[PDB]
Design an enzyme around this catalytic site. Sequence first.
Site, PDB file in Angstrom:
ATOM      1  CD  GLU B  27      -1.853  -0.611  -6.074  1.00 17.58           C
ATOM      2  OE1 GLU B  27      -2.348  -1.424  -6.622  1.00 17.58           O
ATOM      3  OE2 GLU B  27      -1.478  -0.609  -4.720  1.00 17.58           O
ATOM      4  CB  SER B  28       5.336   1.459  -7.814  1.00 20.38           C
ATOM      5  OG  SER B  28       5.338   2.696  -8.375  1.00 20.38           O
TER       6      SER B  28
END
Lengths: 199, 1101, 83
Positions: B27-28
């Site tokens: 997600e990052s």
Amino acid sequence: GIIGAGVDPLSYVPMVGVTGKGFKLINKALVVGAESAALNVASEGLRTSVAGGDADYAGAALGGFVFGAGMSAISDAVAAGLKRSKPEAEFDNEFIGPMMRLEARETARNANSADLSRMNTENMKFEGEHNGVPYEDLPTERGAVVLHDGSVLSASNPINPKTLKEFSEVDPFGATASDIHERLHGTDQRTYNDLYKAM
Amino acid sequence: DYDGLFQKAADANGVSYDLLRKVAWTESRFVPTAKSKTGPLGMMQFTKATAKALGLRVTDGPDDDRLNPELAINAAAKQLAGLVGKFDGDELKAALAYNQGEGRLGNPQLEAYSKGDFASISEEGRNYMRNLLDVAKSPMAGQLETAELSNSVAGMAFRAGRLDNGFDVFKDTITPTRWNSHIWTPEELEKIRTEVKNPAYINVVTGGSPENLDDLIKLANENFENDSRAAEAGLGAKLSAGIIGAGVDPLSYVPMVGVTGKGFKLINKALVVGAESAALNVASEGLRTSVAGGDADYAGAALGGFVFGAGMSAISDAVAAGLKRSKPEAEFDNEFIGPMMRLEARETARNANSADLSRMNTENMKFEGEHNGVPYEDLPTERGAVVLHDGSVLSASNPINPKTLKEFSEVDPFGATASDIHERLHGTDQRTYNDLYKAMSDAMKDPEFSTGGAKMSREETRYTIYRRAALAIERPELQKALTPSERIVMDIIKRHFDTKRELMENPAIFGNTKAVSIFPESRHKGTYVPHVYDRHAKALMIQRYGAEGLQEGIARSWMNSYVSRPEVKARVDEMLKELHGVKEVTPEMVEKYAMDKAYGISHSDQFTNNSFLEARNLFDSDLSITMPDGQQFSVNDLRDFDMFRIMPAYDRRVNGDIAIMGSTGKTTKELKDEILALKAKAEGDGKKTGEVHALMDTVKILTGRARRNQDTVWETSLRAINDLGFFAKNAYMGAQNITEIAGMIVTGNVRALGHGIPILRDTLYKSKPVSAKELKELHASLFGKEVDQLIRPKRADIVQRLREATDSPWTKLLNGTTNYLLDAARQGMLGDVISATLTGKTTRWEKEGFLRGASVTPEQMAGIKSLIKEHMFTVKDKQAFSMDPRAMDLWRLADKVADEAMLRPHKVSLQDSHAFGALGKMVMQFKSFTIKSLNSKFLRTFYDGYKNNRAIDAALSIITSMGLAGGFYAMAAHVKAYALPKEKRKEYLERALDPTMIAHAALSRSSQLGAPLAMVDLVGGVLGFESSKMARSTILPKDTVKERDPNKPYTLMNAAGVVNSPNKATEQDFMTGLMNSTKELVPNDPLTQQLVLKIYEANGV
Amino acid sequence: KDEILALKAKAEGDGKKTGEVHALMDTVKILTGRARRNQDTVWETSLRAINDLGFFAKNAYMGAQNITEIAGMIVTGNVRALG
């Protein structure tokens, strides 16, 4: 399975003998993930400091569950008692909601996980908010609030902050002095509880 | 950034650890702040979930723009743990629910998943779900999907296995069960103590078996009834006769849960020759001991020694054949058959009252010897060993055989007198230490601490017993509420301190009739427990409101008690009138007195010749005053306890002052002045003034500075047993058997943990010559263990509380090994931080997301404080190095890293085996061996059947203790070798790295925590006072130094009984001393022995 | 008493920050225990009590919800029936 089973009990033995005792409602089913152990050193079970704390609660529950299921059955019976006039008006009616969401909570308490009595989720957490806690009104049975978890609180409860507002609404070096007041009001409440137990 | 936060966030409220790391990565891509196309701005990328998710869990959140570095990670970890919980043990659906939303578009997909992986799921959904085809462990994870191009069997395997890449040793091996991991509710302890006969069986759960404790009582009683009916008969009988000679393995045996003792006396039928039934004297008899349980502690040890010894013999025969497949024979002797048979024969002679057939014979001669009196002789046979004059042969790698003791003390890393007082006191205080140790071992085993799941353990489980036994003594209401099997330790502590008090007020109960009341404040009548304030508790209080804060706190905390009691108000004024002032005492007088007497604890670290009795400030320190920041602040928090660095460090000072008092008078002024004024008067040129320096040494020894000597327990026990063999011919065999089992256990641990663990096998235990560049790492590794012992907070309730105030690889289970590994890996991490920062730089640590408890500024400081004090690096070790307010941040950084990275992943891996550090890899490989053993066939099948996370704890604790023992000695060995002349004189290096010395170094070293009382305090006979006789005799004609010399040297308990007690020992005294001081290295519960056995044999030899 | 008043009768009628002295007179009343017949309800306290209890103790959280839920259900049944 007090509800899910589930009985009435409207025609039952006078139920004299029972007190508690071995009543923990692990509804088989309604248990989802059953993490046996613990989340912390808190949790555990009712975190209480009186002996009898696991039996007063149990007693209450047997008496709460039996009464709730009975109110559900009797409201289904009076529903049919009014069906003979008209086939339907709305008849909701009844406490099946609160009693089921209470049975699920009890099962989650005794089985250490699976809070299946949690509405979810959105939104938003307005308006609230009597004291810190923001609630939200669910278009459903009259009331009620939904929490941030959100463990839903049935309307006509002493907790749901919407009702609490509505009632507070229209109806009929060394230090300090304040530290002394709080120490004293925190120890005297404890000795009041210990006195209440013995009384 | 970085996974240290995930290790701490994923061990709470859930969860498959690697899930959080994978979600964060996907997600990052590891960016601290964030923004997205769909709206979410955060690591876990949530904008809709800001308020509800943060509020719904352990920690709440504030705004949109303030998505926190930790509060967000924990909130998302809780959400994912719910998603894992809300559906099933199928984490892939939880991941899909997070990615695609729970309840929007997504909710059909979550339901759609419930019908097979499908296509109802979409572009990002199915692909992201497939990305997490690692841990674990949903059916759809095997169902999502669905050389290289070959058939041939290989091919099929290759294309089906599909490597998982996840493993939590805590979901697939030891699963925390319900009954274990339950802290006991304060009420349930009262039921366990009354309705359970022995609490040891509350752990074993064959079932089952909830709910609830009203069922566990019915089970742990019925199992205790089923035990003493049959378990005893069967095991005792079967092993009693013929344990070796019979003889079994036992390598394939029942887990052996029930047995404790009991009816195990090994009268081997045969090996009994002349069976003189009766007695040789009134000595002999049986184990001549003065504790109850003395015939069962021994028995337990033996069952556990015999089973383990026979098992080591069988496993060395098995590994012999495992090496016969390479070559038919090299020498293979190999093994302990010798020691174990000569121990079985000794046991049979002990139980059958004659026939010492385990006696080599005889000649000759009894040269060379001879460490202390006893002359030995080397037998050309198995390595070592010695033969005695009897000669009862002592296997090599024993703590007794004087050849080994020399080799280790060799190259490796009218009324009278004062001295009579010292020996009377050291002979009665050892006895009261033994009686205290018995009661402590009997109390630290009550249900609160052990039966339930682990709580404070175990260096704290003695600290929170001594805390109760001290706080009950000082204020007696609190007493009244203490467990009985534990009140007998408060009783003995109070009696011991009261006897020292009754003897100090009038130390004239001796030859002299002068010498008056050494004691500080007589009339202050209470058992004075020594108020010795701590260094680190004072550091924590001087970190905030530093100097005047504490200086006023310890003042007003006493001023509270000065007005809160009607009798201390009298006994303070009775002291104040006498010093300065007529009858009326102004409340300014007491204020100045309390302020100036608290200043002694405020600024100068006097409390951690002159003494520390002096800190017996008359006030009572029980009430807490409120600091301007809110926290209630007492003085008992500044105080110390644990009777480990307190009781035997107070008893020596008191016994020194009492003896010097009984000589003529006060210790400081009198003794010092007089001894010096002989020095500065007679004189530099004086040939017989070194003999005056001889008497100055008498003074130091008596007083108790003692020159950090008491070299070893064992060099005392050697002569003890040598002389014990003369009179008591049964305790002679008993004390040989116990020490022989002690040596055999450790010499087994050296072999096993040398073959199994990598850092130890190919370098540390390797013979020679030198690790080329690992010298720069060995120096730092040893400096780490130096700095830890120099800095660590010398308490127990200040370390774990400070560690958890920020909130095998998990201290909830098998806490014994986790404690050792924490207090081991921390020195490695600390020495790495020092060496890296030193001169030259390597800043892996400075840039860390494990930045908790250390902010940018404290981290940077921990750097300059390290740089200022050492150079490429045993440098300082300085008083100012410890009395540094910023130095505790170094300890905290090190411990938090050691509990965040090195010791709290649920799987061993390739994390640092091509990186720091020297001790870091050793402890990492020790944790690896712990997990590997804990996955063995024997041990896993024993846990599933009985649970009992305490037995495998007491198994894997001894292994790691003896292992770190060997490691810390081997690491120092190479450094000392490299300091031996570099002209290779590594033959010396060889003389000190061999299993006959490693087994000994792993005995007289290596705390060995937590133990009530200490190994040294329980045996010791300080002897001479030879140079004292030299001085007395040679100064007989000379002047007045003589006039001083006849003073110091010769040529339960009330104050009247200490004087009457004999001044050397009793046979029962040393017997109970040896039988107690060995319970910390040869256990009692005979099943942890055979667990250690299968742990060793699974590993190898 | 004397001291709090002698700030009142000294400083003063026109003083803008003397209502803030009346603020401290209220502290005094509350502390002393006149308390202005307040303690409005048990339940407005228990609301925040349970809200914060849900954070740390996730089992007593469910217990305290069940007991209060049964409490509310009994009385909401009594209202219907006795109506």
